[PDB]
Symmetry: D2
């Protein structure tokens, strides 16, 4: 009589830009009415980002289109009739391969044109969920923070900074790499220094 | 010496969610510096939505990721050196197949549950570029505006309205169809009327 | 000295048509040489279906493009130097949402036009991994095998058969539904019977 | 009475991996029966690669999924009733951006390890429709055929060959580039030569 989840919502791991479909099977008499929520705020289907669907035998599903990290959160489904109300919950995690995104390239590489003494930042956006490990190299030498370079890593970009001002010797090829469980990506940036 | 477009920008027609790439070839001495614009506002590449790329021999390209109708506009590319500045222009049109988007479905169809006398609207979002022709039917009878139904069509949705209040006879299966040059889509909505 | 997997291959579950990337980290001196295998047969990278990539610090990855159920199997990675050889193994499972594929539709539905006494099969291809549960209904009545209908389900299609020959009463709307953990899909076929 | 194409098939240009939809509108009494053909061989819809669809008012469409260059050809639609038969024809051209596909990479670049005197080929698959212009460079020097290098370009790959046997001086970074109207792509291959 009161609503029950005969098949409960499953936690999902979905690749970025795929559709995530959350499915459950509800029993109860009278037939329970189902509502869907993202972090406790009701989802009203719009036909585009969110589609809500029902099938004979008590099957309910929510399709979330083209998932991004913004969709990676907890969802609830609620089933109600005059006999009671109950919810179930699932998390969606969205897998985003580690990726370096060069805004501008010259010959397949980043290019920074600096003048001597200029405090240069080589700012490189990246993606990745799980958050990727970021590394920088000049040629075949790993860069970390020392007296010469500063590395900045935020949620969305990494910058290699020359806080003391660039020197002529700073010219060269810098390699930035992002790694997580879904892949490794690297790109090169050429820095040249003019007087 | 002054900049010239040896290969000018081409007008593009790109399918929705594909990447649009605008390419040109620039000559001039000194090597011209190129800037890109959307409707006369400079595009600053971010690595995601917009990537700007350059190749030996004067080739310049802008990649616009995952195009939507918002990207369907006029773009300019400008080439400048100390000898002069000139631009070229291309339009991007984004092809979106006609598509009906049911927010909620029961057994593959829309469902509207109405009470007698209720002023019902069956509101159906749709997509399509070129803007699609919208038609409504009840069974095998085309509906237009008459003394009984009102059809609303906007840029993003169409509603079949029962402005006089639904009658029991209004129960049934309504078919909405969107057509343009890239395809036809239709969906059905079942209306039931309770006392 | 001998090769070791500092980071072993991970079992993967990838959505159909996405790229699967298998990644590992190898140590050893001299630097081990890595080969990749699908079910014990070496993968020779072609740049399209298969790309093999290596990065400083001993990282190795195989990218399998646009995965289909044919790619859902066991893979091996082998690392060899003069000190030894060792492999690691991962399974790729490819998630394919349950989906019904109507070859031909009239007004959004299948259509079968039969004559009385004709042994009709309504043959419906479907996809789904895990293999989906298939159900058939006429209106709101579940069909299984009885004295009247025969249901065939294979790896790739389901047919509703009328082995005794269709009767006039067999006319109507048949609903076929495929369900797995990644979604539910249904479609309708209208059967009409002529004398 | 006899069949007529009120709306004839349109020539299509579709991006690689998109769906191509060919649509027409047929008149005639009795209602004409429509068949579809690829290069004069009938298409039998399978629900996957090919879906054939019909809508009230005489609309007929063929959906070709996930188009490849193999689909880029001429199609016919035929409409027949007892009063006559007529066909219409459209070409599908499939746009494939120029793209270089490195089978194996080390640090983002191809890698060829050669011994002195070895007749090396650096074999690089590529895609592009229209067929792309291919160029090779060593550093900032364009390579064509001369007494030292041989360039091979086929429908699917390009090789830079060292027909005389590699010399130590052949070591270095070779850049291969593919260009067509839908974009430019380049990749680098490092060649090292051991005694």
């Amino acid at each position: 009589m009161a609503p029950h989840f005969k098949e409960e919502l499953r936690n999902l791991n979905v690749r970025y830009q795929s559709n995530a479909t959350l499915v459950c099977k509800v029993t109860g008499h009278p037939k329970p009415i189902v509502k869907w929520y993202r972090q406790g705020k009701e989802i009203i289907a719009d036909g585009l980002k969110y589609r809500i669907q029902e099938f004979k035998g008590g099957y309910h599903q929510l399709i979330i289109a083209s998932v991004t990290d913004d969709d990676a959160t907890v969802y609830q489904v609620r089933a109600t009739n005059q006999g009671g109300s109950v919810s179930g919950t699932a998390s969606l995690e969205v897998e985003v391969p580690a990726k370096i995104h060069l805004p501008k390239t010259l010959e397949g590489m980043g290019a920074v044109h600096a003048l001597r003494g200029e405090v240069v930042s080589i700012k490189i956006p990246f993606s990745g969920k799980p958050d990727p490990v970021i590394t920088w190299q000049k040629g075949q030498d790993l860069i970390d923070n020392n007296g010469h370079y500063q590395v900045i890593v935020t949620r969305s970009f990494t910058s290699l900074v020359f806080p003391n001002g660039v020197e002529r010797k700073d010219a060269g090829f810098y390699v930035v790499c992002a790694k997580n469980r879904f892949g490794i990506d690297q790109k090169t940036v050429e820095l040249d220094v003019a007087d």
